[PDB]
Ligand binder design. Sequence first.
Ligand SMILES: OC[C@H]1O[C@@H](O)[C@H](O)[C@@H](O)[C@H]1O
Ligand SMILES: OC[C@H]1O[C@@H](O)[C@H](O)[C@@H](O)[C@H]1O
Ligand SMILES: OC[C@H]1O[C@@H](O)[C@H](O)[C@@H](O)[C@H]1O
Ligand SMILES: OC[C@H]1O[C@@H](O)[C@H](O)[C@@H](O)[C@H]1O
Ligand SMILES: [Ca+2]
Ligand SMILES: [Ca+2]
Ligand SMILES: [Ca+2]
Ligand SMILES: [Ca+2]
Ligand SMILES: [Mn+2]
Ligand SMILES: [Mn+2]
Ligand SMILES: [Mn+2]
Ligand SMILES: [Mn+2]
Lengths: 253, 250, 250, 253
Amino acid sequence: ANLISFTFKKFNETNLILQRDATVSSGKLRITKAAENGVPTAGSLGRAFYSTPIQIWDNTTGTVASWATSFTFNLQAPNAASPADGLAFALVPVGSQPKDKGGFLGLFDSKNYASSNQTVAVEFDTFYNGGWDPTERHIGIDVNSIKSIKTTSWDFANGENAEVLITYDSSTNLLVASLVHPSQKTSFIVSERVDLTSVLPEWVSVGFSATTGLSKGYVETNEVLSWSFASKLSINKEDEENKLAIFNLEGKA
Amino acid sequence: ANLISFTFKKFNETNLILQRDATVSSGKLRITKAAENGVPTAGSLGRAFYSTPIQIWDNTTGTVASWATSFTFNLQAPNAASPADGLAFALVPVGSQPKDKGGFLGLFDSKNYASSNQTVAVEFDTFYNGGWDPTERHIGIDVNSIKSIKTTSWDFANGENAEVLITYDSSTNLLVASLVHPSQKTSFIVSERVDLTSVLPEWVSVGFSATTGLSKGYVETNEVLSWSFASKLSINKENKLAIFNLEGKA
Amino acid sequence: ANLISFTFKKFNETNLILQRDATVSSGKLRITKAAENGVPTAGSLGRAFYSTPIQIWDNTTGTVASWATSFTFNLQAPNAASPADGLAFALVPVGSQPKDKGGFLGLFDSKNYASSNQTVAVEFDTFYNGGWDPTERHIGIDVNSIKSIKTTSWDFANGENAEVLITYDSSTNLLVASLVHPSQKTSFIVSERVDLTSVLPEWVSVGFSATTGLSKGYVETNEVLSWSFASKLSINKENKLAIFNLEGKA
Amino acid sequence: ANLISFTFKKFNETNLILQRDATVSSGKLRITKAAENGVPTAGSLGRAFYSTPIQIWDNTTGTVASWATSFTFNLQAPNAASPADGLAFALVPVGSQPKDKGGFLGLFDSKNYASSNQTVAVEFDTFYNGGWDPTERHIGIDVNSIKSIKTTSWDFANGENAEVLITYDSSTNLLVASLVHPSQKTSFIVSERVDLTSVLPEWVSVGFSATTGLSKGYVETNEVLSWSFASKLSINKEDEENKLAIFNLEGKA
Ligand SMILES: OC[C@H]1O[C@@H](O)[C@H](O)[C@@H](O)[C@H]1O
Ligand SMILES: OC[C@H]1O[C@@H](O)[C@H](O)[C@@H](O)[C@H]1O
Ligand SMILES: OC[C@H]1O[C@@H](O)[C@H](O)[C@@H](O)[C@H]1O
Ligand SMILES: OC[C@H]1O[C@@H](O)[C@H](O)[C@@H](O)[C@H]1O
Ligand SMILES: [Ca+2]
Ligand SMILES: [Ca+2]
Ligand SMILES: [Ca+2]
Ligand SMILES: [Ca+2]
Ligand SMILES: [Mn+2]
Ligand SMILES: [Mn+2]
Ligand SMILES: [Mn+2]
Ligand SMILES: [Mn+2]
């Protein structure tokens, strides 16, 4: 079985694919631009991916990979009544380019079924777009669209750390995403079956995508403070389930 | 830092401390009793704990361990009109013997706070008990009491595999517990701060405890199919959750 | 796939089975007697094992487990001219007791292959017993016999740390034991095809056994400073070695 | 602790960098341009590497990283009297190109010490030069030059499957390289302490540097069956050893 793993408790530029306004400042993945005075800037778009393409399914064997990612992010808005737009963990083609800004989070073009994009994303959305979004702040699973196929409620804590875990079991074809705010003892979880064989390509770039608002006032920081990732691809049998107990302790702590 | 980890994708009697009715049958941990034909027995208790004691906190240095556990369990009742009582993952003292059965889940004696227990449990309760339980099915965090300090609703599906992950971050004192039913794509989560230095002893045994109903009809199978665990205790002054569920569970 | 892993950097008395003179003090595992002055004592015998039994071959599935260990040991002798006897990493029946004191290392009875004991050991010999030992200080593989099945020449560095790595694979069966002395920048390696189904029972306890001289001036310390171990039993019909050494090594 | 690891049991081109005369195909890693008939070509330079650069030491803390690797590499030559030249586990800089062919192993320009090369490699020599080499076959460490300071003796097994383990410890600066034969039992080991903060830079491309001779007579093949790697960076003045037992079972075993 082929495996690929990494742990970034501190960020570096050389092993990441930085796109647009994404930059590594003082060990922190600052996806959206900030001023030298500490002010978030509007109309920003940033993308950061791992330098190694990751195999999530094989053509010649028909086997799906089991993979898991963890990360801690912090979204800091000067005003909590005017934030936009949010950040996402995405899997995208090897040389895929940034798309529409703002509510599309640099990942999608529209709310309809766009199979050509070939992108699966777990979004952490802090702006109500109406055209697709639920009423309050939410975590969503995005399949070839910004209109999430499933969502859950996210009681967002302004400027507090958010510890995330995203797991995909190939045998049950289930994508599970959870968010905990350690400062407020709050917990949130999403789970939905997604088949990666027909949605995503064999090789993908794994990383982050974030935007700010299309208006001057709707601004936030979109920093990623830590990020661990693991994947296991089976040889011939469908797949064996991954180990999650030793995943978060060796990576997140 | 000292580490301790294991993965039980198939169970063995040799490396577990079996208590009461808990037994290993065809590589699957049956915590409560069941007939050769497949029907669960009423009024049963079982406990299964790992062989080596795990250090959660060191008194002299003050350092507290970060740990994570993943397991898949199967609760199957002949009739959903009468299910009892439930199963729990718990941390207990070294020489901990089974306590009161039934609603107390073999881990507690009374509804009031008793420091003599020194038990931290994550319960997966399916029966609506008396002066301690919330209205529906629930996950709970038990601390020296059967009355959970915090609960979350859990839509339980009969005879369907539940994927559990429990995590304890030392630096933030946060105990998080999650349950996913992959068959119907349902997920549930709870999080609460627990001071394990005040509650647990320095060395603990980790594992399971389950009970069937005290009445003759209220019966269920309390099975655990897989179980992976890891712990990390520092030396002088977080755990990798990504690689945990893969190598072990995932 | 069943897994079991742990790493030591500082030792404790709770997560180990301690036999005879085996003592834990200041976080270091002292297998043989060291007086309240810092002086080693002759005639001492000790055994230290992990409290969890480890499966090395399963009968019903017909597969042999692949394991690996890594430990830093220090042999501090007041006189290099009279050193006895050494230490060994061993796989032994779960509740098995130490045997002959001295050159037999508290593991074996005689120089002949006796599979009533069922003990596989990797010795680090620092005394010349001659009847079964080569000329000088040596690292050997012991299978049911104190007379090693294979040995390699070992430049024993007195009072210096020795970082060992022992590996066993299922596909190749090549038991490979390597020792490095970082201070002297030296390295030595042993390799022989051993099959565990012919020797050890389904379940064993892994750990260490060390002895001092049968004389009165033959004194040395047999300390273990760190200890890692990982094992994997392949279900149905190769284990990683790189991702292990850094956990406890890298 | 910044972590990075991967285990190949089945190689792919999509996650492999190629330099000069490298090629990735047919269920193995043929580093040199081999013909259809299985013919070793002389006057070549193969270079296969992993996409992510790997950190050796930090600047903001000054902490050296411990790493470990394991691979099953093969050297096969028709004539026993003419083996040339071999391969080396290259830690070549990211922004660096291949150099001289032959006895230089595509790593260094001259036999003299030069800190501009910034490369440390584990040599697997087969040809007799002697100007910067011992009297026979040798496995050692190259420091800022093709000339070695300490090497071991090795029996050149003609086309034998051999599992290798190369490990590094930051605390004692020791590089331990072992080579075992599952069929022949001929095990060999070498270790030497060299400071890497003085020699190597922060980030390097990690893989294999392989070369052939100048004459058609002196030829051999270079193949890799399975390859594994792990690396750990310490945080604040640890000077500690990394786990080694948990790694070797992931790929090899
Ligand atoms: O007010 C901020 C908003 O501006 C809108 O034009 C845009 O569609 C949203 O995504 C958000 O950026
Ligand atoms: O009907 C079965 C029930 O019986 C009660 O007496 C008991 O408190 C419950 O735990 C449950 O076992
Ligand atoms: O000098 C000490 C020695 O004494 C011998 O009689 C014995 O055979 C050796 O094992 C060693 O203990
Ligand atoms: O005979 C072949 C040899 O040719 C030499 O000129 C060269 O220095 C050696 O590396 C080797 O290739
Ligand atoms: Ca939105
Ligand atoms: Ca109850
Ligand atoms: Ca001897
Ligand atoms: Ca040469
Ligand atoms: Mn949305
Ligand atoms: Mn309850
Ligand atoms: Mn001997
Ligand atoms: Mn050379």
